[model samples]
Target chain A: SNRQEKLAQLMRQFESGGLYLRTVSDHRDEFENTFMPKLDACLGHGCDERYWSSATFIQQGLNGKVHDPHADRTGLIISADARLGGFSTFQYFPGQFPKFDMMGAYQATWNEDIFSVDATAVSEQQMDELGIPDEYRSVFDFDRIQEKMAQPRLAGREVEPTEAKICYQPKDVLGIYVDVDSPASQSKARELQQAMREQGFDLPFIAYRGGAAQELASV
Target chain B: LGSMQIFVKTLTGKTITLEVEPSDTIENVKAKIQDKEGIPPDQQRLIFAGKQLEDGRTLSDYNIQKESTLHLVLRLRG
Candidate 1:
């Protein structure tokens, strides 16, 4: 099937650090003909056309780092992956609180109030005290400090880590899917753009528009 | 005496299949596009494999094949 073939091709590209960008308004046919079918195949359910109209697909290589803790404002967000490596960690901090307060609650022991922790200042003992696993130590290493510093820092309170789950690798096709109808999704998409930029990842899109227009406008 | 079907994908990502002979000129393709898409021939710019199709050249000149996809970018008015 062309849909299956295209999905396979897209997965191959994404696993190799290639990004696929397409806007529903600009590439309506491709979205309906190619992406919709591929998405359905990956999800094993029928995805409505309305979702496609307000969707943004983001694909890139993670290099095994924990993403900055953040929440999606969108009504729906689906993530897919081709290669099986690392976990999609989701941490929840409940209740209405200031960003600083939330960060304090989650990383209280780290003793860093900044948006990102300075890895050089962090000792092995501190990491152990914080209960961060040995496998995830690299997430706080100095290698990405410069890249992390380049991104606009959000307030510490912006993220909450009350509850958490580490999911297995996503299916071999599909990456992150964001529905753009809500203001929350719009904000999430913008946050993703900033995160991608900070990571120095390149995302070359095709016929991109809709909520993505606002996200891309700053680029 | 040979005819083939080729796909022309518009800037909007819609694919339009046109039936033409390998001897068809680029200008003829433009006229057909204008006829089917309601865009004037003067405004259409057909690109295949990174090369712009010359008005005087035939489909055979560019080696366009059946099921080949050509990108159609529109020329904006000044």
Candidate 2:
């Protein structure tokens, strides 16, 4: 009972947090470049998340990959969701995700393969069909990600941090965060879930309720 | 930098010519193709002289020649 006092002391620091929009990428550079500029300029610079989507209850209950420690999913696909969702309707987008095996080893076989294709000729329809959903499109949105080298969008900021700051992270198992109030954000999240399902993967969604977290039914 | 031109033929029958340095890794060459070809880095499979080229080794390790041709394929599952 006394330990609750100590916990409450720490809990007070997080009590006033608000609903935030987030997107996760295996690519750390994605946060450093684009989301940094957009959010940092708008709200403020965000922080890195410590939770793993695979370790969370939603992932566990969904029969999704557990993302074992030695697996690549911990670092690549199904790993990082520290950034916000990439808004669609822009010719240039974010989240250029590719297919990955659902055995908790995301892109394991090809993890070391460091090749990028000039996506200038890759049509939008082809890209979406290829698993490069809007949420997984790219780092910056000046143009198509593959065509633009998928670099971050921090060109003219007064200060650019090498890594993202840790403003907030859930103690729970969620890695990626999105504002539950936005429809476009929800659609992008649904696209990621649907695309992964098509490739034989299933994960759960949790809604943000200001102070506490709520579980959302998977579509 | 001393670079030589190599022709890469994709499974889609798209042939692209790239200038690669002898010291460039297959990964390096693949990065170039990614900027121009739109293929994800991990999805590209490069084959040279009847063997799959490893990304860790250099093109010089495999004796990549000027005007040589390599086959490019995808590592994706249907």
Candidate 3:
């Protein structure tokens, strides 16, 4: 039933190309036009990949009201090498990233749900086991105080573009990974691949903005 | 005003030819190209002569003799 529900939801979602995992019934037109050329763009900017992660999310720690506080794996945890690991816009740091652009961290659900709690800790018992920093938990750089963050007078050092460009540059790369093989990524990859074949793209690499194939280093 | 022309076409297939006065260098023409074609100004390419066209080189130094035909091959990529 879970698989059936997933299949139904798959049918309801947006599919740009015909690359989605082959199912019982589907249209060939998606493969002919859209899928192939999209693959070609990936050839230049895409990296071929295979994944086998040793990590798994722990259950949320609840009295099983769906496991409240059940050791849930906190996502939004980036790796050291996840640093924009691709050929496209991966290295282009800008002047003001958070200011907003077509692609930005502000679009992510994680950032959207970042709520600030504003109360001094009444006791040491209130501290989180994960170990929140003393200054960050009890106090925060809020309001104009956030502005003091970049002020030269406070830090006694003027900020330069090198220091700020990372903030200004893009931190995310997709329309959210709309589930690879869930139709969007696969359909997109296949559509681009077919079109690229027709268009003389022999080694076309399909690049869809999702978590299907992943980043590969250029070493 | 006496002028020499540097000309090329863009990827979008627009023709660009500009006349430079003695004071102007190849750099001036490139800046003008960026405005018209919306390409990055720093992107460089070869002129007919084997010598690297100075972004700031003047017609006097370039010395386009009578009726020279400079081919337009833009090295700029997106």
Interface RMSDs of the predictions, in order, are 21.4, 11.8, 25.3
Candidate 1 local Cα displacement, residue B57, angstroms = 0.9
DockQ values of all predictions: 0.01, 0.06, 0.01
TM-score per model (chain B): 0.91, 0.92, 0.59
lDDT of each: 0.41, 0.42, 0.30
TM-score of 3: 0.22
* Backbone collisions counted per model: 10, 31, 29
User: Could you give candidate 2's per-residue lDDT for residues A112-160 as a string of tens digits?
Assistant: 2223322323445544444443433333221232222222222321211
Name the runs in model 1 displaced over 4 angstroms: A1-219, B76-78
Cα deviation in Å at residue A84, candidate 1?
25
By lDDT, the best candidate is 2
Q: Give lDDT tens digits, candidate 3, residues A119-186.
A: 22123342343233332321211222223222332344422111111110011111111123244434
What root-mean-square deviation over C-alphas does model 2 reach? 18.3
Candidate 2, residue A170: lDDT: 26
Off by over 4 Å in 3: A1-219, B4-6, B9-14, B65-68, B71-78
Cα-based lDDT at residue A83, candidate 3: 23
Q: Is candidate 1 or candidate 3 better by lDDT?
A: 1
Listed in order, each prediction's TM-score against the native is 0.29, 0.27, 0.22
